[PDB]
Amino acid sequence: NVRLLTEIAFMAALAFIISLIPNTVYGWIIVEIACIPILLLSLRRGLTAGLVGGLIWGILSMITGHAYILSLSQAFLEYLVAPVSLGIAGLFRQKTAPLKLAPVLLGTFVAVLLKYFFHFIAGIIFWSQYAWKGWGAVAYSLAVNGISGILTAIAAFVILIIFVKKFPKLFIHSNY
Numbered sequence: 629n630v631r632l633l634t635e636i637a638f639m640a641a642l643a644f645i646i647s648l649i650p651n652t653v654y655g656w657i658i659v660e661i662a663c664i665p666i667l668l669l670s671l672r673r674g675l676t677a678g679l680v681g682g683l684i685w686g687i688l689s690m691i692t693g694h695a696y697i698l699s700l701s702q703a704f705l706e707y708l709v710a711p712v713s714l715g716i717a718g719l720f721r722q723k724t725a726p727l728k729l730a731p732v733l734l735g736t737f738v739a740v741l742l743k744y745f746f747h748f749i750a751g752i753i754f755w756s757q758y759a760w761k762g763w764g765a766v767a768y769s770l771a772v773n774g775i776s777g778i779l780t781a782i783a784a785f786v787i788l789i790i791f792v793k794k795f796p797k798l799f800i801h802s803n804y
């Protein structure tokens with residue numbers, strides 16, 4: 629209630645704080661560990677809570693000057709649509725015990741995939757001026773964003789697996 633709103637705000641604040649950590653692997657290839665609090669929020673509280681947490685994270689990135697903004701339409705795609713889209717993991721919420729790892733991992737996979745699909749589309753339209761010598765716009769965006777998405781999923785997998793084994797109730801909301 630009040631509690632749902634606090635959880636959302638705190639996880640979005642957490643994602644933003646985490647996003648301040650340097651995460652560059654090479655060029656524009658990143659490991660986006662900042663997705664994890666939004667993933668966890670979504671898995672615990674469902675689609676709407678996740679969408680809104682993603683929204684708040686994106687707005688925070690932009691208004692603090694930490695987003696890479698090339699245009700209104702690009703920033704809309706990459707810092708509203710993209711982070712919001714992590715909320716899709718919410719469709720994999722488990723409401724009842726025992727907690728299973730399967731929906732956690734499938735939901736993480738589908739949500740990181742969806743986010744980076746939007747970054748991949750953005751990459752084609754707005755970032756092709758950076759494409760490695762000899763690479764076309766699509767192939768360059770596929771490699772940058774394909775690799776970033778996989779790496780981000782790897783990291784999300786590692787952390788959430790630990791969280792499932794050690795703190796499975798992070799994932800299951802209860803009153804009481």
Ligand SMILES: CCCCCCCCCO[C@@H]1O[C@H](CO)[C@@H](O)[C@H](O)[C@H]1O
Pocket residue numbers: 637638641684687
């Ligand atoms: C519906 C649009 C709302 C417009 C205002 C944008 C930010 C909304 C919440 O702001 C704050 O973000 C801080 C980040 O650290 C948190 O510490 C704090 O808990 C939270 O309250």
Ligand SMILES: CCCCCCCCCO[C@@H]1O[C@H](CO)[C@@H](O)[C@H](O)[C@H]1O
Pocket residue numbers: 716719720730731734738742
């Ligand atoms: C790129 C967009 C991806 C679309 C995502 C489709 C989400 C469908 C989620 O299904 C749910 O999965 C749960 C756990 O696996 C099942 O317990 C439950 O029966 C089922 O309702």
Ligand SMILES: Cc1ncc(Cc2cccc(CCO)c2)c(N)n1
Pocket residue numbers: 656660696706746747748750751752755756768769772773776
């Ligand atoms: C080729 C290419 N280069 C840069 C970007 C911009 C970008 C990529 C992934 C994630 C973010 C947001 C969090 O930082 C931004 C892009 N989409 N495609």
